[PDB]
Design a protein around this ligand. Structure first.
Ligand SMILES: [Ca+2]
Ligand SMILES: [Ca+2]
Ligand SMILES: [Ca+2]
Lengths: 499, 519, 478, 499
């Protein structure tokens, strides 16, 4: 269709309006002092949410140029919680500050590409200093402590996550499921996980976790493309859910039936490494690959992940596949990919069964366990830092190592320096305090983990009081915010359809 | 869809208009002097109602942000009369007062978070003082006295409610049904109650009470989710040959078939199974042996279709929060054996948790269901006094729990004495406390205002300077002793009205943004 | 659906506009001098009517709040005519006057509730005095005269009602059908009638010969009884009629008069057709169901009478004795042509209904004079304050409105003098709008049943009291 | 339908508005300093691209006359990247500058046709001088250098391109597929290609590459026209896709509906004229194992790729002695186009199997090879000039040989003179510096390969620094730009439908 094109300053200023509309909406929920946001419904009472992810997913604008900038910062900041599980709102606040002060200097005559270089060099040094203050977590002692903090002072949850990672390892597969009663238990079952996600978002079973739950599901292994093709195998299977695994018209047939009352299915994709894993996935679930003269318990489907929990094969035939994998190990960079498959079959999947007195309390703990698990998995990888937005301020000391080739690149370093204070400035601002300018000054002049705690409105040691953020959360927020702001600063044109 | 966003003062002020539109409409019906509200109808004469709940259900606004505030106060205040049986309009009047005075101070420089803390600390002390001034109701004598007051001075109803609570206890299951004649009687029949709702409001039989009533219904017990609408077709078709309604008890768009089929023609309802996990499979058997049927586990829904496996009961009532099975057709023989089985498992007493967890299951099959059959000379007279029994029953149920206090809004004023124990960390928190102090007078000030007098300021002064149960009775327009005169409220109603009102008023003060779709 | 809300003065003022629009349309038809109203139709010539009820049923307004006030008065004033024969327009005129003066004082600062208390106290005393001046009607001579006046001065119609009420009694069942010829014949036939009626609007046909089903509780017999005779279905659920403690006792009474039995050891699915009571002819319209010649056992019906023959309950089942022992008189009216027959047959039904009401609560002077005479009872009305006293005064001036509208419809501007000459006079002296002369209205034949007059005032004060106490009007957004 | 007509200057001015909107949007992506362009999406985050080809395809205008000017320049400039593999953005920048100065002199009173004559004489001289300063590429040493440059300094890619051209020759057919594993290999099979592509774009299997890919399809040779008729033999092979090769309407649309729907994947390609087309039909039979005009008459093998202007068959179904029998028959005629007939079967097709560590890196490396392969074929053909827009400035010395009859024709010569420096002026402008006027004068004064490198923002020798463009790219962008700009200068009327 026809287009409307905006150029340079007129395009960048209108993008700022959309970025500001997104940020100002989500940033009021930042921190423990975050305020309440009302999201209207079509009928009934509205939704009261203090979560910044809920507010962000509802943000949409009438003006397409403003909506572009709002959707740009949304997609980039959303990639923070994908590999971490927290910090989307922090990245959004940072992205607004980096882009606001960047445009001010671009208007002043600074080169946008030099401001980008100064930002990119400043970010590498802030992350460097950020890892210097990072404290790694390993062992069932301090792992259970991180899980207890993320579970809001629940030591029984921390040990459940600690003893789970002591079986399959720190890189192992951990799954949370509902128990059969008050007792919470931990067991390990045969299963694997790969990096192929769902083909369409319409396969999501519950928007709470954005996953797809298939209970007692049949598995279909196919090495060819999709575009349905074979009705009888698919139609007769509807007489238990079915997971279809192919190499790629037929997708629309599965989406309509997914929303339909019956025929509940999901579609997940799978060189020669894929041919061997399909037979390995079929030997685990007892199925048969179709490639080869073939003609015609729980499965969790995430965005980037697919996990088969307790796939039922033959116990002896699955172990016979293990002998073939390690047998080829002794016969050989190429051997690294083969040993990965060895840990998937023999490693298993640790399942965390959570239960409570009532059903609403059983789903209460399951919500906290999945949150505590996701945060602890990130704390084991890149470590932990001080929360409350202080770690970004402490990491500002590393800016002295940033080298600016000219004045404009030095300005970009100053933009990052002033942006690091914005998350803490907003956390104090959400308390309704008019003195928040002094609060930032005391925390900045201090050292270490000393900072302002917005929950009790008291100055104390944040790590000692349980206020901490995963290092992966803090560094990803700054990297993503600086990424989207640099793309918007260097954007000379904005193209959109005509209404 | 694209969104429009309001921020801070502009959002809170727009939300206040919706709360005022809701409150000003419902509050004219408060008290015995409450005035009449005309509600337009599609065709014919309009509906005249003095009931604040009926007026509240009709309130809807064109402005999306204003409608949000109106629906916020509506849902939270509706929870007052949900558990306590009354107090919805009082919760709305209190919510408008706390929110109005709250917004005045926010624009004056007060932090909303410290106001909320001052609000919450004041309410905890006012509820505390309500507990101290509350008279606990116990014993067959005064229970009938409370039931007589709630019945509008009918001694027969109070004695009937008191006798019902004597058979099944305080927590027993009591239902109100129509009788066959002028004689009012009480019948205790075998049954139980579990908390589960219908899977869709379209199953509701009588939209006035929002209940699904089934006479001589068939009970289908299944422990797994049904998404099929295929394997269940032969057993559902075999129920059409019987002609009696069907209640499907399962774990769970297959429910859309039964919702549309029963709405447009031929009469069945479905609810979720009670509990979960291993405790669900055991309760489904108790809900089976009681109704005279068997559980379908892994038999199957497709094959093995037998009406002997289906249970049946005389009457089954399903509200949104609960499902009641009255007079199950299961024989008394195996029911006695099921009791000794659970009592034998309770005699083992292994885990301290499972000990009382199993007794909750035993008490449902032991105490049964007490049925109150109400009748009169004419059919229209029975429907009048049947609604009075259902109101008097729910009022007495709440009176036995938390006690009773003085009505006429005086208990809220008397409970202000507890504000001296409310500690304030700063002036903003102290401001939130005096916001609660001025809000407690609002229910009485509105009750007096509904009399039409301009002297309400003087009436509020006499009652506050009075002592104990002395207050103004808006019905007779006389200063007297309200408890001696029969003006009383369950303590649960009064404390829930203030708690809910302060809850929704605190959320709106802490609301910095309002998101709504573009028109 | 979103709503628009009005409060207090704004709400009640717009409600008054709708009430004024309804009253001003119907009140021009009041009295014998009432004027003419044209009602548009879809195609052809419009309908012209002097009847206030016809104009009332056509009143619908575009403004929802104004329409609510019009439908309020319409529904309440229509209840006056449930059993009246007249008086629907009078109740609307009274409701307009009470509500107008009510709002007028509410704006002046009077409490609406104190006005309502004064209104209700004033009505009880007016109705009390209305019964003191009322004259009871009993005996075939007085009933024949009242029936003649209700027949538009037809002496034989009044005698027909009197002789029919002479054999079956004052409370007896009287029905009207069409004669088979010129002769108008009255004959007492066996049967009973109750107050129930058809459960739906349809099946008007309801004339059923050889009815040939009594079911107390909530299928194959319908197809069985169809071949071998229209069936009547009496149950609590080719015609069906609805059926507390005295309900089942009368089910056996109908089962004895009919040749069947009540279908609780009887199942409606397994019930034989021999249990179906068969009568001669059944006539069912809306509020009544008439059974004629139930064809039951004369020995069983005579035995059930002896079975019947502690205070209000003893007289409750004593009315069932009049069902079996008493009969149903049939009035068959005929003439030379069908146009003169069906018209005269409708005049008998309208005259019988008025005569039935005159026997119950009595008769009072017409022309709106009874409401003015009954104003003397207001001296017994006790006022607790000045606001309630103004409520007494509202009713006082309201009672003059019906007579003032009758004189206004004559087109004269002298109606103010006619109202004063009536109030200064005592007794039955009044103004006859037919001859436009002063005379005694009872001797002149101008009279209304006391039930008609008291119901118009009680209903008018009722609907006007609700509107004065209405603080809110909620309507759907356009 | 009714029309709106604009005449002369009124029509040419409106066309310029559309030309400017196309150029100004695409030109910000020109050069290594090119800046991002945000293109809106129906839902989700918008597309951010630095590619001028992606931006150009999105430009569409509301005004009909303005859209004509944008579509004229876009289609003509797209022919640059079609044959030469690149330079479609440069052609748009040149066409904007030529048409801008053209209209400016037409308003000054210069005859448009003499401006066109002056432009065309100048282009022939600039292209001639561009050939003089070009450097021919030959041998495995020079080809490996060009392939490594187009691969962003990846010696494995440059050597593979030179090795592939070492077998099939300079003009031989080279195709790129995806390898079955980590190892990158090379294989040669017996195949041929012809200049006839697909009949309809709806047969495209893969998008954004403007092509169609048939994996393991069947070939049918038909000498007549296809207008349901031959359907009886079509469903016999429907129980694998098939490739129909015939002279061509009615039944062609039936295959279009079956394409987008996904039932019986098929593609139609015109037969390669007269007796010569039937002669190549036998070569398309014997080599492909089919029979000219039954399931025995349809050959097949490997994968068939179908471009717009091209179609390729791979590896054939023919027997080893069967292909040699027809090769001896064509070689039977001794004593100019008959040599190209036997150069197809005997030439073969070189298949490039590209692979990487993961599946995501393979498609990034594969597209890198496909761009390098297309860039190398232009280097071996017309040579290589200096990049960075310097070759257009150096070739301006050839304007002395251009003979101008009158002043208007001399004006056209100078229009080309000022336009040749426009691409370099835009590359420096994309850096954000306001001093770019100095960079242009400093490069113009220097001689040879000395020019400005916008990647490092420093002056150097561009040929030794890796900055180079194929001569075919530079000369085509100028010839295409001057072509469309001359048509618009001579356009006296613009006719378009009424809205
Ligand atoms: Ca809405
Ligand atoms: Ca209407
Ligand atoms: Ca859009």
């Amino acid at each position: 269709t026809a287009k409307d094109i905006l150029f340079d300053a007129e395009a960048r200023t209108k993008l700022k309006v959309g970025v500001d509309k997104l940020a100002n909406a989500v940033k009021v929920t930042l921190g423990p002092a975050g305020r309440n946001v009302l999201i209207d419904k079509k009928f009934g009472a509205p939704t009261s949410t203090k979560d910044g992810v809920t507010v962000a997913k509802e943000i949409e604008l009438v003006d397409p140029v403003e909506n572009m900038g709002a959707q740009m910062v949304r997609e980039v900041a959303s990639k923070t919680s994908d590999v971490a599980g927290d910090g989307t709102t922090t990245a959004t606040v940072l992205a607004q500050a980096i882009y606001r002060e960047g445009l001010k200097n671009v208007t002043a005559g600074a080169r946008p590409i030099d401001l980008k270089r100064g930002i990119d060099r400043a970010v590498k040094e802030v992350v460097a200093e950020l890892r210097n203050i990072s404290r790694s977590i390993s062992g069932k002692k301090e792992i259970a402590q991180v899980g207890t903090i993320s579970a809001n002072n629940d030591p029984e949850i921390g040990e459940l996550i600690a003893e789970a990672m002591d079986k399959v390892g720190k890189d192992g597969v951990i799954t949370v499921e509902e128990a059969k009663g008050m007792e919470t238990e931990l067991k390990v079952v045969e299963g694997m996980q790969f990096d192929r996600g769902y083909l369409s978002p319409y396969f999501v079973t519950n928007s709470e976790t954005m996953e797809a739950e298939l209970d007692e599901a049949l598995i279909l292994i196919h090495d060819k493309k999709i575009s349905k093709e074979l009705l009888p195998i698919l139609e007769k299977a509807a007489q238990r859910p079915l997971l279809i695994i192919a190499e790629d018209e037929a997708l629309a047939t599965l989406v309509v039936n997914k929303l339909r009352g019956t025929l509940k299915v999901a579609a997940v994709k799978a060189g020669d490494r894929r041919k061997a894993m399909l037979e390995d996935i079929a030997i685990l679930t007892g199925g048969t690959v179709i490639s080869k003269g073939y003609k015609l318990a729980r499965i969790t489907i995430d965005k980037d992940n697919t996990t088969i929990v307790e796939g039922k094969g033959k116990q002896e035939e699955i172990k016979a596949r293990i002998n073939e994998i390690k047998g080829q190990i002794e016969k050989s960079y190429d051997t690294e990919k083969l040993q990965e498959r060895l840990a998937k079959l023999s490693g298993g999947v640790a399942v965390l069964k959570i239960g409570a007195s009532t059903e609403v309390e059983m789903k209460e703990k399951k919500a906290r366990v999945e949150d505590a698990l996701h945060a602890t998995r990130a704390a084991v990888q890149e470590g932990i830092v001080v929360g409350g937005g202080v770690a970004l301020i402490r990491a500002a000391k590393g800016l002295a190592k940033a080298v600016a080739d000219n004045e404009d690149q030095k300005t970009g370093i100053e933009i990052i320096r002033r942006a690091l204070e914005e998350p803490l400035r907003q956390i104090v601002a959400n308390t309704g305090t008019t003195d928040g300018a002094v609060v930032l000054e005391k925390v900045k002049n201090a050292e270490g983990d000393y900072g302002f705690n917005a929950r009790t409105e008291q100055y104390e040691n944040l790590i000692e009081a349980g206020v901490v953020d995963p290092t992966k959360v803090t560094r990803s927020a700054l990297e993503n915010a600086a990424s989207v702001a640099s793309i918007l600063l260097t954007t000379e044109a904005a193209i959109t359809d005509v209404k």
